[PDB]
Design a protein around this ligand. Structure first.
Ligand SMILES: *[C@H](C)[C@H]1/C(=C/c2[nH]c(/C=C3N=C(/C=C4\NC(=O)C(CC)=C4C)C(C)=C/3CCC(=O)O)c(CCC(=O)O)c2C)NC(=O)[C@@H]1C
Ligand SMILES: *[C@H](C)[C@H]1/C(=C/c2[nH]c(/C=C3N=C(/C=C4\NC(=O)C(CC)=C4C)C(C)=C\3CCC(=O)O)c(CCC(=O)O)c2C)NC(=O)[C@@H]1C
Ligand SMILES: *[C@H](C)[C@H]1/C(=C/c2[nH]c(/C=C3N=C(/C=C4\NC(=O)C(CC)=C4C)C(C)=C\3CCC(=O)O)c(CCC(=O)O)c2C)NC(=O)[C@@H]1C
Ligand SMILES: CCC1=C(C)/C(=C/C2=NC(=C\c3[nH]c(/C=C4\NC(=O)[C@H](C)[C@H]4CC)c(C)c3CCC(=O)O)/C(CCC(=O)O)=C2C)NC1=O
Ligand SMILES: CCC1=C(C)/C(=C/C2=NC(=C\c3[nH]c(/C=C4\NC(=O)[C@H](C)[C@H]4CC)c(C)c3CCC(=O)O)/C(CCC(=O)O)=C2C)NC1=O
Ligand SMILES: CCC1=C(C)/C(=C/C2=NC(=C\c3[nH]c(/C=C4\NC(=O)[C@H](C)[C@H]4CC)c(C)c3CCC(=O)O)/C(CCC(=O)O)=C2C)NC1=O
Ligand SMILES: CCC1=C(C)/C(=C/C2=NC(=C\c3[nH]c(/C=C4\NC(=O)[C@H](C)[C@H]4CC)c(C)c3CCC(=O)O)/C(CCC(=O)O)=C2C)NC1=O
Ligand SMILES: CCC1=C(C)/C(=C/C2=NC(=C\c3[nH]c(/C=C4\NC(=O)[C@H](C)[C@H]4CC)c(C)c3CCC(=O)O)/C(CCC(=O)O)=C2C)NC1=O
Ligand SMILES: CCC1=C(C)/C(=C/C2=NC(=C\c3[nH]c(/C=C4\NC(=O)[C@H](C)[C@H]4CC)c(C)c3CCC(=O)O)/C(CCC(=O)O)=C2C)NC1=O
Lengths: 46, 161, 65, 189, 36, 160, 160, 160, 161, 161, 160, 161
């Protein structure tokens, strides 16, 4: 509660890391398209 | 594309071992039931315009889908769906004589889910036609071959659904 | 309008197990506008042509193709 | 199975048969080649798309022998069935990656081979475009004038291989989007 | 004739349906009186 | 009211009142005596509405009056009449202020989890306003019954 | 339509529309008010062709309605009328398009697979359009039925 | 199962599975077939549990079948046998699974806004599983009604 | 691809109806404009190399891209920009004679967002080009006739963006 | 390949000069006969299967050429022999609509002198099969149009044998 | 002509021609008697059109009139004046033909490689026939000029 | 496409300038290495089949990949892997003789990462083999050309991984 938010570099969830440098290597208003639409379901029903 | 001869002779190849006694019981199972398959293969091709006819009368025809608004109203495509339902009939026999659903992965289910949603055909109505075709086949060839031919019919309904 | 070409041509780089008599001797019907290119393609393999009389006929006409 | 079918030559390149035409006075050997032309140029069956058997005039010129299969592949793809099936609902950069799929059986070779046919397809129509493919040199020694075109598996250009199984693992009309838009320039000019 | 004749994955009620009286309320009910 | 509704977005962006906001404050001072007028119509027709619109609710929904629902007898229907005479007053309190925020901060913000914790179906309150709709438009001239009918309109769509 | 045949004929040339093809729309659109003044009576008189189509078929082809034939009894004289009711529309749909190409893509181009499979003879449905040809030419004037009669006659040549 | 639940606790702690939690897994598969033996009493008599609950539903809540309610008539009352068998099939999934992770994925996380948009009462479902609780446990043995009754109580807890 | 008069056809045939009275009126809006469309068709076809001849001079020439550093300076790349701008003019002529944007999204809008980004050619100069083509086509067919032309041009440049 | 219309146009450029009034009367003699020869095309396009059916049933359906031996014994040598008949009938419509017998010289009559000889095919059946085919069309299109198509139809007889 | 443009189109799809084509060929012959009227207007004008328009392209383009151009000399100004006699006598075959298949093969096919070999500007003869087009609309009665003037517009748009 | 002499040309081309003083000495820096690149490329071309057969023995043999299941197990794949490695050598001698590493991105590394990911080729065993290949060809060309050869393998080696 005393810090500014900053860009941080996660390691533990799988898609958490490479969706950050597909979010931060872009500049602002670089693309109108969203970078990750949603996450892929891997099987029939879950 | 593989075969129950070849898929047990290549899987034993890639492990580096030879014809094991557990591997020898699968070939002699295929050599025992192979005479049942080849007499069942001719009876499909003799009735191939009639298994597809009784399938659409028991599942598809006289419904909302052949009524304008449904996807089958264009006779461009009711010619194409009998062509489409012929494809699952002949490839089930190819899975029957191979004794192997491996042809269905590489020649039927390559990109089959994307091309049906790209046209917007109903998924379950085709799956209802496979459920029509499995009981017409088992009556016409006898239940000892229809209980094996229908296994590759359920391999199609697993990939389509 | 079209021609009736016949020609003979071997291949140089390979020895083939298939028979290739229809590939080493032709009697083809080729149209007028492909023939400016189809004749030149036998020159690159160096095959000789022999009888190239036209079958559609009417030479020297202006219109009507 | 991960070491079995999943080795990198996807085993239908060297167990799919080809079709020759050595037997023009045979009649039943002719009929399964004419279907093989139909199932590689249009690559579905042409049975549900024709009011009546349409090409049986120039099908019958084959077998009599005064045309070849290089005649029969060129004039059939020039016909109006190929216009309705593969030229109208696609872009004219999709057609270049669709004409090279069936005729010549590969992807386009270079960036310049896109530029070569798009030079042709703007000036003349599909008429001289389809004459530019099968009368090229690259049709002549790898297929010949007695063979049907078939799906073939190149190795020497770099993007020629993986753009074929991004062209052939799709079925027909699987995507409206073209698979390769063009080739990437690597530097400034 | 026509007769589509399919199968199904729902329904099969065993009817019960008891029902009731439906009486109207006079427009005077004390709006104010409810509790404490 | 509208003076608070015009400033609560404006002070949140910390600026003076916009020219396109004062005119609605201006035109309410021209046209707010009708809101005084149609409030007096609802006071004289206070019990007059729900002697048949409450019956119109039980005409279309006899679910709650039967043995098994919520309403049984006189008392329990009288507390429903007390809750619906809590309800016609709240929109009458809302037309004289001219927004949704007098309606919101009394009854609408906690309308959902109260009624799910009461056994009352929250869809069933909307037909009683829908029966209150057709009588309140009919008892008023159609000019004023449009905009006062437009103030039941937010109150419909926040129930269901 | 008449434009759509010339559009794909233009792109197979990949050039602009030649003025041999432009005036064939100029003959079309100024007769387009004439052409919509033809087929709307065939939409208007709907049943009169249809009930005079089956009875004029059955005297020229009575083995269809025998036992063993496809059309037999009740519910298989009506769908053969209803499959005939489909091919009445496409004659009108070819007229207001001014060309026979919308008849193809919904109604002609796959007949030889679906009527092979269903067992309905394609000659016998061809004589039904030949049976309904005479009753439609009587309802129009003679120079107006002369162009609309050929629209039947293409489907005759497509079925036969 | 616990195995798809104790992992999710241990993955969130970024540690291995602690051996206090392993004996929960070790005592699971030895007592597994006893939990399977509960389920064939459920799916064997699964036509009898829906009959004994639904009339007892319409004696405790007899008002959804009233006219002008929610589910009256032959087609809408027949949904509620399927709408309770959907929960009955989900409960016998969990006793086989041993835990709640099939039920909370399938039937719990959107039970409100589906039924609220459909207009169905929530508490009628909440007594419908409560009708199904005492019926199924009366067909069940004395130790087994204690454990399998708790999975019924989560579906009461799902509506609560 | 489909005509505007066949847009009346398939929409009334997915509902399975006939030609009804407002569907006659959809054709009647076409038949009052078709005789002007073919009169507009002659002047655009005769000046097909005489609309782009002024348009590239009006917006693209003597700028950074015709100078070296930009894209149009080499004669291979200038040969495509004369080609692509003749290309859009021919397909807008097909849009005007059909009365539809249905030819454009099939052909000249499927890969156009991706083939232009992959080659690095700027999209925004084309937006300046066809809007200048929209201005220069009205100067020789008339503002009454260029207005029906000036619908599908905005369908093109919206699809570029 | 040229018609009667560009017959006089091709003679105009061999002589080089513009066509004069005698050449004008040769062109406008088509226009007095143009509206009636298209009336033949209306009724011959309908029943084109009917003309080639009963012409077999006149003298070629119970014949020695249809019985063992012959050239219509098997169904495949049948399947060209009826396939030649509508190809003569389609190109007779192509000849009679253009005024010129020169269309079917290079498209039909190009190889028919020697391909019927080399294959062992009786022309004398097919010459017998067309004079009965010629008489039934003039009854079906009317005698005013059936005469003029016959000299394009007897033009086929001069090139056949 | 419009026969042979359509006959090769029917043969390429291997069928009897469309009834959409039957209204094309019927309107050509029934309007042919005024189509031959347009050709005989060009008989007595065959010196009047070419005398003005060759000088009109010399004032639209005085590039050519100086020494160093391409028509410069009494055999060289007679070169383009005679070629303008050819293109007038070319397309007057195509008025009465009614489409472009006489003009395109003997006038249009090999042009660009010829004129660069002949050294003539293709843009000169492109606007030269534009000078030929404008006086052709004056002596005819508007609409028949408009159906014959499009073959001028075909000839303009197909050089460059 | 992109050479080294063309690289200083094309940088001078997009400015629109001419051969400046810094552009000449960079261009003359290529000529000063002109005897090194020619003499080394003759050495590698004479010893192509021996520099390959050492590089596969230095890194790839006697491991999992030459055993059953490995990607160079069978005689198709081990004969393919020699050819698939020999293109890395032959194109690296193109890039030395060009003097610019941009010939590898045009013709080697274009779809190469998309192939080997779809084929199951171990990319890290390939990049181990080229890294073993870079050492052994440095002993055949000397230390002067060994730096210039050693760059252009590791432009391939980072395009893979
Ligand atoms: C028919 C039972 C359902 C249906 C179908 C409908 N299908 C169309 C069909 C396509 N089907 C295929 C399928 C295959 N091609 C193959 O090569 C194989 C494996 C051997 C399969 C399974 C493809 C590729 C198409 C579309 C391509 C084309 O147009 O030819 C269409 C056609 C698409 C169109 O726009 O015309 C329609 C309706 N709809 C139903 O009513 C049934 C459920
Ligand atoms: C060998 C040391 C490693 C290895 C190789 C391997 N590769 C293949 C298959 C292919 N290699 C290519 C390569 C290229 N194509 C190009 O255009 C270029 C640039 C000039 C290169 C480098 C291609 C296209 C293929 C696929 C088809 C083909 O072989 O032509 C295989 C076998 C697959 C097959 O079907 O033969 C192998 C074994 N694998 C290893 O294990 C080594 C690490
Ligand atoms: C010109 C006004 C603008 C411009 C154009 C430019 N385009 C290209 C190259 C291509 N454009 C296409 C797209 C299509 N070609 C088609 O035929 C069709 C459908 C009918 C489409 C949608 C394609 C495929 C190419 C590649 C080759 C080709 O021309 O076909 C270039 C060349 C880029 C290069 O580096 O080669 C240029 C320069 N550029 C401008 O500056 C103008 C804004
Ligand atoms: C306007 C702001 C406002 C609202 C919304 C409100 C709701 C409200 N309804 C209540 C009771 C109640 N309200 C109802 C009314 C109904 N139940 C039904 O099923 C019918 C749909 C509906 C009849 C119209 C009933 C039956 C009770 C008593 C519940 C019980 O005792 O079981 C109570 C508790 C007692 C009370 O103070 O009245 C509140 C606070 N009160 C308010 O001041
Ligand atoms: C617009 C394009 C179009 C065509 C061409 C079309 C044909 C068509 N005819 C059908 C049935 C039928 N059609 C007939 C028709 C006939 N039986 C005879 O013996 C006569 C020869 C003949 C007509 C006179 C019969 C009997 C059936 C029912 C098949 C059966 O019951 O086995 C059906 C299946 C049921 C239906 O949806 O109607 C189709 C789809 N549908 C279309 O949408
Ligand atoms: C396993 C997870 C799962 C859930 C939660 C589920 C809910 C569900 N409930 C439905 C209907 C329904 N559910 C009910 C509920 C009831 N009937 C009554 O009268 C009582 C108030 C109450 C319970 C006894 C009703 C009335 C409908 C029909 C709604 C309508 O058609 O109006 C429907 C639409 C038709 C159907 O499939 O039945 C769904 C999808 N489906 C699922 O697969
Ligand atoms: C095996 C290869 C083969 C075939 C196909 C064949 C057909 C054939 N069918 C003929 C007549 C015919 N064939 C049929 C046959 C039939 N119609 C029916 O009612 C029955 C369902 C069916 C057969 C049982 C009929 C009705 C005619 C006379 C047609 C007419 O007179 O118009 C004729 C002319 C008579 C003759 O034989 O000289 C031939 C050549 N001949 C052959 O060598
Ligand atoms: C329009 C362009 C065109 C022409 C001109 C053409 C002629 C033609 N007629 C042929 C055969 C044939 N033609 C006939 C002819 C007849 N049957 C008889 O008995 C009579 C003598 C006569 C007519 C009643 C027969 C029997 C054959 C089959 C010969 C065979 O295949 O052995 C063949 C040999 C290939 C085939 O079997 O079709 C050609 C190429 N084909 C064409 O596509
Ligand atoms: C219809 C197809 C057709 C063409 C093209 C044609 C051309 C033609 N151009 C000629 C001369 C010529 N025609 C020109 C034409 C031009 N120079 C100018 O000043 C103008 C800008 C331009 C034409 C408008 C020139 C320069 C020559 C002389 C050849 C030379 O020395 O370049 C001659 C030689 C004189 C003779 O006829 O004996 C022919 C035949 N003849 C034809 O039948």
């Amino acid at each position: 509660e005393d810090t500014v938010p900053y860009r941080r570099f996660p390691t533990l969830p799988a898609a958490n890391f490479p969706n950050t440098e597909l979010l931060y290597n872009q500049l602002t208003k670089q693309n109108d398209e969203l970078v990750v639409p949603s996450f892929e379901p891997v099987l029939a029903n879950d | 594309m593989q075969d129950a001869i070849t898929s047990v002779i290549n899987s034993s190849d890639v492990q580096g071992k030879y014809l094991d006694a557990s591997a020898i019981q699968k070939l002699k199972a295929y050599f025992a039931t192979g005479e049942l398959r080849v007499r069942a293969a001719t009876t499909i091709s003799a009735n191939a315009a009639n298994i597809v006819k009784e399938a659409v009368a028991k599942s598809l025809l006289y419904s909302d889908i052949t009524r304008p608004g449904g996807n089958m109203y264009t006779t461009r495509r009711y010619a194409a769906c009998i062509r489409d339902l012929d494809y699952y009939l002949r490839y089930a026999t190819y899975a029957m004589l191979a004794g192997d659903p491996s042809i269905l992965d590489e020649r039927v289910l390559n990109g089959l889910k994307e091309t049906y949603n790209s046209l917007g055909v109903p998924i379950g109505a085709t799956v209802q036609a496979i459920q029509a075709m499995k009981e017409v086949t088992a009556g016409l060839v006898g239940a000892d071959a229809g209980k094996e031919m229908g296994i590759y019919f359920d391999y199609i309904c697993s990939g389509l659904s | 309008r079209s021609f009736k070409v016949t020609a003979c041509v071997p291949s140089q780089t390979r020895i083939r197990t298939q028979r290739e008599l229809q590939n080493t001797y032709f009697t083809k019907l080729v149209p007028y506008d492909n023939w400016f290119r189809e004749q030149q393609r036998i020159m690159k393999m160096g095959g000789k042509i022999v009888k190239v009389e036209l079958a559609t006929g009417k030479p020297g006409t202006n219109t009507g193709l | 199975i991960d070491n079995q079918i999943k080795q990198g030559v996807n085993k239908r390149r060297e167990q799919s048969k080809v079709f020759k035409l050595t037997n023009v006075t045979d009649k039943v050997a002719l009929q399964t080649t004419i279907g093989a032309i139909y199932r590689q140029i249009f690559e579905r069956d042409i049975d549900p798309y024709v009011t009546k058997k349409e090409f049986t005039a120039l099908e019958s010129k084959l077998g009599n022998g005064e045309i070849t299969v290089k005649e029969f592949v060129e004039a059939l793809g020039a016909s109006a069935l190929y216009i309705r099936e593969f030229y109208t609902p696609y872009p004219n950069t999709k057609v270049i990656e669709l004409g090279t799929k069936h005729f010549l059986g590969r992807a386009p070779l270079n960036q310049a081979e896109i530029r070569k046919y798009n030079q042709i397809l703007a000036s003349q129509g599909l008429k001289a475009f389809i004459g530019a493919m099968v009368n090229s040199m690259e049709y002549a020694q790898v297929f010949g004038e007695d063979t049907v075109p078939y799906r073939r598996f190149p190795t020497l250009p770099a993007a020629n291989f993986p753009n074929t199984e991004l062209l052939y693992n799709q079925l027909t009309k699987q995507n409206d989007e073209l698979v390769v838009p063009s080739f990437e320039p690597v530097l400034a000019n | 004739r026509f007769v589509p004749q399919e199968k199904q994955p729902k329904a099969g009620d065993p009817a019960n349906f008891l029902a009731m009286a439906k009486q109207v309320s006079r427009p005077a009910n004390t709006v104010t009186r409810v509790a404490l | 009211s509208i003076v608070t509704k015009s400033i609560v977005n404006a002070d949140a962006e910390a600026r003076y009142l916009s020219p396109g906001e004062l005119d609605r404050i201006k035109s309410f001072v021209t046209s707010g005596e009708r809101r005084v007028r149609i409030a007096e119509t609802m006071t004289g027709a206070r019990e007059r509405i729900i002697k048949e619109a409450g019956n119109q609710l039980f005409q279309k929904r006899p679910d709650v009056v039967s043995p098994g629902g919520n309403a049984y007898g006189e008392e329990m229907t009288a507390t429903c009449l007390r809750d619906l005479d809590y309800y016609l007053r709240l929109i009458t309190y809302g037309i004289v202020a001219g927004d949704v925020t007098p309606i919101e901060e009394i009854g609408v913000v906690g309308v959902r989890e109260m009624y799910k914790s009461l056994g009352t179906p929250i869809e069933a309150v909307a037909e009683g306003v829908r029966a209150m709709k057709s009588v309140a438009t009919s008892l008023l001239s159609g000019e004023d019954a449009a905009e006062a009918g437009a103030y039941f309109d937010y109150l419909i769509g926040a129930m269901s």
